[PDB]
């Protein structure tokens, strides 16, 4: 009956804080505030967070602390018919590990390359440069920080597509190995250590954000970047695309449906106030994004003033923001080597605690389903990370970015949405809100308010569908720069995107032919919760 528990309350919180906080809080968010009406964007963001995000963030956490088991077993016990939810969710977190950990590797490679008196990405007279190189971003040209990250670090120029991955960057394979070594000795003996490793990975970014906020705000032209960041424009409120961007970002920044919030909370005490944990964590997540926004744009404004570069050419999203745009600015300011070291170290610690939970979601949900590998945690996570590293060598290739970009757009993008959708429908309609409220009451003390109950069954499916429907609208064949992916790569992507949620009906169908009885007397069996004995 007894499983292990967090060796301290903060361990759990820092684990959930650490997972939820991501580089997406750095480059997805401050960009969205920029393009969708400044401070006015906080209104659809705030509302979508209140009625959509936090309710879902709460739900999975509550399920974790209640059913006390991983993603596969929790949904198997909740609703036997939709046990496939547990399966679809876990291997989603398995696919992500194939491309997400290469971001941390990039951050380490830059950290190792920052040990110098003159940063290598400042000049345009290097071995890797082209005549189209300029000291900073410009319309029609390339920058020094861009060609460094592209032609030297990635050597992406030597690739003609995903069909041609080229050679293997062993300086990159080393960094990837280093990452998996760190993720290894952190999750190897479980929450006893992983609940302590997060004390660094989830706290250091805030330390770095502090001294980057100070450095960023002392720069000349820092206040100008703040204006670009938060100058109100309530015309965006009328735009549904803004409400979509607000809804999307809110949902993807809290990250339910990875079975990690489910896994993490499953190590909590049964009578732990999980309601306070959900509200606290979700806020800090959104608050972290807000803080990071100042850090970026104070530096971004500094470039648009004392370096003479258009704000349109620096207000960038994606990895380009912190691998090209931001380091270029650091290179100009005094004590550049210092800011460069702590910035890339921040980026590394921003992904580790997220990767921890992503991997932990796998290990935990598998240990509760198959008792054999629970006694074999070390030997299992050995082969798992070895598989990650082996396949991860494809990410360390010259055309490794093309493989990374394919998985990024397919593996987690759509697979999550229709998985979390079935999560909300199962709990609120199949399982039912009235007995879910009964569980939470028995745990923390009080049944959820009418607000959370309405949000869980009416607002949540609409919210998720509203996001899913617009992501369908803005779809266009996978493209990066000039390179258009061949339609077999897109087909390959949809397979990886489909191999997840294909578990929902498949397991439902397979677990429907058993056990014996009429059609009506089997839906009853497969909707009967495990705790009716």
């Amino acid at each position: 009956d007894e499983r292990e528990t967090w060796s301290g309350k903060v361990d759990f919180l820092l684990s959930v804080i650490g997972f939820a906080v991501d580089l997406a809080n750095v480059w997805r968010f401050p960009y969205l505030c920029y393009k969708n009406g400044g401070g006015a964007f906080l209104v659809p963001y705030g509302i979508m967070l209140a009625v959509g995000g936090i309710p879902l963030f709460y739900m999975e956490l509550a399920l974790g602390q209640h059913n006390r088991k991983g993603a596969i077993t929790c949904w198997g016990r909740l609703v036997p018919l939709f046990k496939g939810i547990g399966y679809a969710v876990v291997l989603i977190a398995f696919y992500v590990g194939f491309y997400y950990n290469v971001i941390i590797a990039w951050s380490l490679r830059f950290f190792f390359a920052s040990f110098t008196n003159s940063l290598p990405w400042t000049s345009c007279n290097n071995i890797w440069n082209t005549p189209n190189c300029r000291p900073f971003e410009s319309q029609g040209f390339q920058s020094a920080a861009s060609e460094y990250f592209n032609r030297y670090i990635l050597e992406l120029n030597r690739s003609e597509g995903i069909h041609d991955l080229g050679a293997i960057k062993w300086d990159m394979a080393l960094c990837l190995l280093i990452v998996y070594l760190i993720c290894y000795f952190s999750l190897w003996k479980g929450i006893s250590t992983s609940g302590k490793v997060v004390w660094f990975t989830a706290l250091f970014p805030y330390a770095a954000l502090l001294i980057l906020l100070i450095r960023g705000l002392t720069l000349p032209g820092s206040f100008l970047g703040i204006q670009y960041y938060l100058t109100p424009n309530f015309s965006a409120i009328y735009k549904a695309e803004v409400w979509a961007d607000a809804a999307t970002q809110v949902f993807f920044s809290l990250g339910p449906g990875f079975g990690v919030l489910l896994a993490y909370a499953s190590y909590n005490k049964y009578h732990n106030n999980v309601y306070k944990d959900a509200l606290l964590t979700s806020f800090i997540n959104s608050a972290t994004s807000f803080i990071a926004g100042f850090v970026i744009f104070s530096v971004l404004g500094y470039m648009a003033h004392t370096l003479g570069v258009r704000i349109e050419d620096v207000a960038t999203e994606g990895p380009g923001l912190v691998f090209v745009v931001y380091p270029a600015a650091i290179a100009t300011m005094p004590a550049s080597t210092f800011w460069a070291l702590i910035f890339f170290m921040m980026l590394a610690t921003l992904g580790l605690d997220s990767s921890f939970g992503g991997m932990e979601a796998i290990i935990t949900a598998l240990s509760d389903e198959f008792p054999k590998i629970k006694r074999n945690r070390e030997l299992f996570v050995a082969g798992l990370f070895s598989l990650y590293f082996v396949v991860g060598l494809a990410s360390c290739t010259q055309g490794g970015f093309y493989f990374f970009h394919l998985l990024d757009r397919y593996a987690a993008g759509y697979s999550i949405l229709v998985a979390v959708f079935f999560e909300a429908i199962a709990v609120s309609w199949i399982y039912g809100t009235n007995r879910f409220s009964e569980d939470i009451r028995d745990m923390i003390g009080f049944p959820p308010g009418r607000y959370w109950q309405v949000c869980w069954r009416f607002v949540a499916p609409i919210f998720l569908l509203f996001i899913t429907v617009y992501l369908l609208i803005g779809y266009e064949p996978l493209t990066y720069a000039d390179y258009v992916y061949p339609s077999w790569a897109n087909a390959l992507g949809w397979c990886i995107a489909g191999s997840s949620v294909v578990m929902i009906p498949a397991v439902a169908i397979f677990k429907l032919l058993s056990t014996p009885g009429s059609l009506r007397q089997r839906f009853t069996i497969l909707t009967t919760p495990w705790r009716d004995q």
Partner: antibody, heavy 119, light 109 residues
Framework: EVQLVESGGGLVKPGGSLKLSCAAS????????MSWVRQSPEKRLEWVAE????????YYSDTVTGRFTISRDNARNILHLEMSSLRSEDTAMYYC????????????WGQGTTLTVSS | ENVLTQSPAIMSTSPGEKVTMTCRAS???????LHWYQQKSGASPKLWIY???NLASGVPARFSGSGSGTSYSLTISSVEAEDAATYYC?????????FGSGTKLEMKR
């Protein structure tokens, strides 16, 4: 609005069995965890059993457990308490309460039914 | 069990006085889990003060609550004749639930 009435109760000889009932009205009964609390003739309060809004989580006292069986009927809004192997200590005025929210306690108490267990 | 002890058992008081009844627990009790009940003679108890200090609905502002851990107390600022009853404190911290021994108010003459 909210009104709780306790039926059953009476004189029962030691070892006997009696079923107490509580008729609720004025609230969605299937949303409030009911609970039985008895009061000895020396006006001393003692908790007996709590039942959830769905009757899935049951809690008993140690002086009572093994003998009593609290029951719920959210359909007809009735709270039951089936007692067996009664002893003289069980002699009390049994009350019906609805402590759905723990951090608040029992907000409404019934009139109370009297049980005397004597030979 | 988490036995609650209230002192004092019978308390005499002329109207206007300020009275204080105490409730100490054998074990540490969460602050928001301790509640108070008033039971007038020949009547069922009533929720009087929930969550240590928060007065219940209908309870005059002359009542108050204070305490933490293993020591709580109910206090009536200015006693009126219609406050003559028996007051039970109750901890919700854990199961099994336990009521205090109760204190009895009696007016002076």
């Amino acid at each position: 609005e909210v009104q709780l009435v306790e039926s059953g109760g009476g004189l029962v000889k030691p070892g006997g069995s009696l079923k107490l009932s509580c008729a609720a009205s004025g609230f969605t009964f299937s949303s409030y965890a009911m609970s039985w609390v008895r009061q000895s003739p020396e006006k001393r309060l003692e908790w007996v059993a709590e039942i959830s809004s769905g009757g899935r989580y049951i809690y008993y006292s140690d002086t009572v457990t093994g003998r009593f069986t609290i029951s719920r009927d959210n359909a007809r809004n009735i709270l039951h308490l089936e007692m067996s192997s009664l002893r003289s200590e069980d002699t009390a005025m049994y009350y019906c309460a609805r402590g759905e929210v723990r951090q608040r306690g029992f907000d409404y108490w019934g009139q109370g039914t009297t049980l005397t267990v004597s030979s | 069990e988490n036995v609650l002890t209230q002192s004092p058992a019978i308390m005499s008081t002329s109207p206007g006085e300020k009275v204080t009844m105490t409730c100490r627990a054998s074990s540490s009790v969460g602050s928001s889990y301790l509640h108070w009940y008033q039971q007038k003679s020949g009547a069922s108890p009533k929720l009087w003060i929930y969550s240590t200090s928060n007065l219940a609905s209908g309870v005059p502002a002359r009542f108050s609550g204070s305490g933490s851990g293993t020591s709580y107390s109910l206090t009536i600022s200015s006693v009126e004749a219609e406050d003559a009853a028996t007051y039970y404190c109750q901890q919700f911290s854990g199961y099994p639930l336990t009521f205090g021994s109760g204190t009895k108010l009696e007016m002076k003459r």
